[PDB]
Amino acid sequence: GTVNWSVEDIVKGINSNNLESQLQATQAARKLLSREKQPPIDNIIRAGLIPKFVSFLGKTDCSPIQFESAWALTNIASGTSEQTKAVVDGGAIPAFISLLASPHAHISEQAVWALGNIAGDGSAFRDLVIKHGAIDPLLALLAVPDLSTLACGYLRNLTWTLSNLCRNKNPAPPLDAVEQILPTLVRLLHHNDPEVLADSCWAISYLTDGPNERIEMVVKKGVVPQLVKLLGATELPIVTPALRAIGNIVTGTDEQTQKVIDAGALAVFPSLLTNPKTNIQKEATWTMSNITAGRQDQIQQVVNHGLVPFLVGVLSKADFKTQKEAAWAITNYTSGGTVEQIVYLVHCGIIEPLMNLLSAKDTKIIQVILDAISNIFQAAEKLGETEKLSIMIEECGGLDKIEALQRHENESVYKASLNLIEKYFS
């Protein structure tokens, strides 16, 4: 009988000061707010119901109204920032945090969920949840000998909320909050549930999304090898964030990048660089480009793992965004590599697919490619083989393309294309 009430009926029941009447009206609100299509969130807010729901959260003597109000508030907080704000403005944060201590699992779970929605709004509400002291009691819920004893849905909700507490930038989460949460994240990273693993990998992705100091906090926990293992998972929803985290780490120092290599990450790239999921191939190629921007010994590891042919492959055929990352990978390679490494690159067949991409109308990739060709020519100069190279480029139709780029709209483009022709083609 709590199905399809009007907001007016709900207000009447909640204002009755009959606890049972209040419970029934709150449940009716929960059901209204639970419908997928246009729940009357703003109407509930305007009716002034939020403070009432928040008050009901504190009714330890009536667990059902605690649960119903927690659920109702959760769904209001799942809306726009303004709707989440109305929940926060009603004093919900400390009330939900107190509910984390409820002896009723379904109730503490609902509080976890609601706090996830609030923190998920952005860095301000995230940090406000942290300031109210949510982390300790959240982490306490996970303090058991074996995660497997927790209900699956329960652990998934907790993991997700924790990941939202690691989420967002400007600013990033407080350093001490991150240190507090990390050890639990590391443990979750070793759990066997696919959804827990996915969200945990996303959490690590957020945390490594910043300057080297932020990256270092994660790497020093020793999680890199586990992330590399997760790179090989069959579940693509695990691979995506695992690879994002790994990619974030190699944007750091040479030493942080080396940890990724030492952990054996490169052995997985033959598969990642040919992955049928476009976005995985893209971030795999992005990751490669940051590794080829590393030291010569790190470029050499790329060579040893046979990944150059895979980069030629991606450059030859892939989604355009991926090809652009491949272009960057090649320019970095040619920029930081030895003459021998550059010779090897050309021998792998890089030239033709490079020239073919000059046909694209993205001004940046053209710049990247022209820079790569200059780098390769510099290497040929040291070998006095600049003539072999010029012939290579002309035979696959590169000369024709480079010549036309002399007339290019863009500044740096027609310039550099001019230096090339003037310098090695006349």
Partner: peptide
């Protein structure tokens, strides 16, 4: 050579907020 960031495809990420349906 510089190290570079990569755009974040939001549709790949966990939801920021979740409505409980049942």
């Amino acid at each position: 050579p510089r190290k570079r960031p990569l755009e974040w495809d939001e549709d790949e990420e966990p939801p920021r907020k979740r409505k409980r349906l049942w």
